């Protein structure tokens, strides 16, 4: 609504100077923020004089590499048409001793001399890393020079500084204060629509074959950053030319024009490129968008209503809470047998209020507990603040909360702004293992038990998992749902996967013999023969006893 | 493997390049080894050895020896490179065409096309090592001009270059005659139209080349006789005050830029003109 | 003619053998952009610029780069790491700048940055001002030349983790090539290449030498040839007059290297390729693995189908399984199963034994788990094999392994096989879905399997004609493959002892039945009955855990 009020309306005021807003896709909100912070102070400076404020200048973009930070900065600079001074981290740091400071001084001096200007300090983490990493005295001279130039600029006005870095913590803390890089923007991995837009942007000059399904590629590519999609397209084209190399004579200097005219990228080439590509964005904590509704989750209707009352009303109707003077709850804690669908509940909650989602699995928590990770709890919550509203899902919380890390989590959660919509949802299979400190009021104090699916819930789960897989017409799943009492969602997923495995084995055997385009009930029976409950009765009794204790203690 | 480019350079440069210039040393009393072999104190001394120069009271290293030192330090043979050219004259002008995503310098600039800070530092080598006047009359007449008129003077000196054995791989410019352009000398200085000077000097140089000479420097007089009865002059230029004022340094730099030294070890093909300036 | 016509500019594709896959990759990544730029103009793409080769030292990375450069006919600009880093302060950066500028000026060009791990070592390995200025200069040069030039950059390094991570992203060395140790045919080709000017004697059996050299990189083979020639010179030294400064041409004409010299050289060689994790080729079929037929079928339908028929998996919307976990008594033949699986899908093979994992746990190794999986990605399709996984999975190492298993691309053909003797002792986290979820029990061989093992182990030994092994196979109930191998080894030891005794007395060409009887007299089962009962109970519980 109002947030993207600046995006609504030759081209590019009419190399790397041709980049424009039409060369970007899937970052509408971040682009709106950057434009609102850059264009208005420069293009229309009289608004802030009329209303009587000094607009903030420092903007700090950060996200996984390849997300388009340099692209966004250059596009904004070229669309504004203002004196654009580009400073590269490594380029400044490669200079001799004493020159990497004079370069910064002259850069800022020139940017101040000329008309409304934009200074883009690309990779600022190179010239101002965290103090512990600033080894040497020149690494301190450069940081001090940067700080002095930043401080002495606040009076000048009509000059905006933009900086880009991979992680919020990678920068010296002194650079993130009032009169410095105060406004922060977080770039996350794009969603399906964003990936489709990027794919359309990149594949506009290729000789695509008519049998291309860019929507299918967008659906398949999950966790792919814009750079990953560009590499995907390049590798697909390389595969196409490799396939066509048979008709090409490498020895001859020139290739036949007719062959060059028959080049065409086919969907199979894109599938091969997907096979080869290796994204790395998800290796670190990132902000992602989710689109799970209250339909990928079966059952738990009472828990769904409880979650709605807990989260939706604070976000959608803050006025009522202000009227009654009651503040909303900060966090929730799911407990129950594994495979009951806690992550799906977290994603559904995030999608209901249309908030971003950050997930921190068990391995990440352990890696932070061992101090061998780039990020940290403070960094996670800084990203959550920058991307607010956000839902932070801490999975396998029992691994660390059996502590330094738990202390950091408590500090960050206590320091969270009450009115800022940043909810924290913890998941654990062993609620008694959780440290009692975390469960105090103002923390993950609202505990919710997630039970195993019931008959109708099992039927819904089985239908949902099998929807995108061909099956025998007139196939019944009621018997399978009924016979699997005590099975979690993971067990039903295993059953359907085994049925599919049997079907594919039969299909391959039939093709080799020379048929089986469905999944008949015999496959399901055979797969079910080797499937068993993954939750022991003792654990179920223990969870039921804990639930009974909680009910008795609260009534 | 690419090497030095095919470009004709002076005979003196070629014959200097042929030589090696090594300075042999005899068995030091600190050597521990038989007759055959050599450790560190008996190895031949490179022509650019700083200790040898400072011991012999030589203030610069005879440019050809500087080139030898650069070649020895860099450009491994048979591998490790494709012959990076060792010599490259400095250039401080801004890159008017960077287009790294920005318009030219006047309305945009990046860290790649921004001239870096300049660090002045005394040069450690000199192109021409000696300047030799064939006869005393050549400068006696030049000074007789001032003696008779009282104003200063200015003239180009013609000649040719040759070897100089008194310094390792050194060059001497031998001057045969001096030509004085039309200039308006004055009590405290002199002036001369640049256009007339160059227009006349073009044909004068053509004739001199036909005669075998070449233009190799400029000479001017800065004399102010003292009041003593004899013929004596004040020592205006000395250690604590200036040797060459700024204006004459600028003029000498312009003259050097206009007489490039064709060389075979630089991308442009020229480096540090062999043009000398003398003052009386 | 050839090569577009000692002097390293005289090397071509005919001087490299046994690396045709990586050679083809480098050629398609270098020649095509340079020789025929119009293809990418027609398709409207920018071909990738950087390429990063890595592998054990001595595997011929510099040789491959030189050969590709010479065959392309472009402007090769070899840059050394040690050579650049020996310059004074502020001079190495200038050399880098001048090299890149000259390469860009004379396009098309091929910049080869040899031993880049010395210019841009891992961020924790530099700790110096100059070591950071040089890295920043290299990054700036790489970024600047991304466009605006028809230039290709090639780099060589020992391991992926020995380079600054900033150099392995888009617009930089975004293509990886992994060089592994050659197989028997590759070693034969290398031997033929090297021993083409030598005065080989008639009795040379290069095939035999290739068979007897395992883990030998090309440098090792060159050293082997040099050592053999030196041994020949030593043997003929008796007729050489050291005092004289001349040697008769008659003696020189008599020089000739014989198989004995090559055997001596094999004896006196110190290969080091296998001391670190390395990608390698395997040639084990479903015939060396006697028995385990049901396990063979399970492995086939688990691994071969995803690799050979991905279209079916896409049709049914099923994601192929990542890895499996073998368990059972030691010596049951799990490594053979892993090698056979790798061979069937024609994939590479990376083996990580117990000592390597323990060394990583103690943090005193040059390779990490992330490095192993980077090599696996670069060499895909690959089979990673974690042997005796229970030593570490009794930890930060286990956490790293889980992280890497979660990270790996699903569509990538990288399969992780784990072997362990104590399935219960393994960390439960390793057995979750999306990880080594499948568990396979490898029992002791049966009578027919034992006889097959015995026959397989005796194909390289001169057994007595008309010999039988059914009695030995039946007598060894409960024995694993290792025990039967030990029985065969003891029989061979007795036979060779008797042969040596007979020769000294002076006959014994082949083993006899009594030798096997004597060897079996000392036979001992390596698995106690209690352990077998425990494994059977665990398997029965697992079957019950998968009941109706
Ligand atoms: N919407 C998009 N988001 C991200 N990248 C995009 C997008 N559309 C196209 N791209 C392409 O993806 C690549 C992104 O590279 P880019 O330099 O912007 O990444 P970066 O990691 O943010 O930058 P840097 O590290 O240089 O600051 C470029 O090829 C860009 O053309
Ligand atoms: N196919 C081959 N593979 C490997 N080495 C080979 C091959 N054919 C010949 N050789 C010999 O192996 C040696 C190759 O050593 P080389 O210097 O290329 O290896 P490297 O350790 O990868 O390189 P560098 O240290 O320069 O990065 C040379 O003796 C070469 O003659
Ligand atoms: N209502 C449901 N309850 C449980 N699992 C479900 C449900 N609907 C779908 N699933 C399946 O459960 C799996 C995810 O389980 P997950 O949310 O990770 O459980 P947990 O949080 O206990 O680990 C997916 O295969 C998903 O499709
Ligand atoms: N079918 C087989 N089962 C077991 N061992 C076998 C089999 N075939 C051959 N062997 C022998 O087993 C030995 C290797 O055993 P290995 O695979 O290391 O066992 P494990 O994996 O249990 O440690 C080799 O000497 C090999 O010849
Ligand atoms: Zn000596
Ligand atoms: Zn520029």
Numbering used by the authors:
A (entry chain B): 21 to 29, 71 to 75, 207 to 594, 608 to 719, 749 to 789
B (entry chain G): 107 to 386
C (entry chain C): 71 to 75, 206 to 594, 608 to 719, 749 to 790
Give sentences from the paper.
In unbound and substrate-bound states, this loop is positioned over the central pore where it could clash with substrate as its being unfolded. Along with Npl4 residues 106 to 581, Ufd1 residues 228 to 256 and 281 to 311 are now resolved in our structures and form a tower atop the central pore of the Cdc48 hexamer.
It is composed of the Ufd1/Npl4 dimer adaptor, which determines substrate specificity, and the Cdc48 hexamer, a AAA+ protein that couples adenosine triphosphate (ATP) hydrolysis to protein unfolding. S. cerevisiae Ufd1/Npl4/Cdc48 was prepared and incubated in the presence of 1S1UH-mEOS and ATP·Mg and analyzed by single-particle cryo-electron microscopy. More than 700k particles from three datasets were combined and segregated by 3D classification into three major classes of the Ufd1/Npl4/Cdc48 complex: no ubiquitin nor substrate-bound (“substrate-unbound”), bound to substrate prior to unfolding (“substrate-interacting”), or bound to substrate and unfolding a ubiquitin (“ubiquitin-unfolded”).
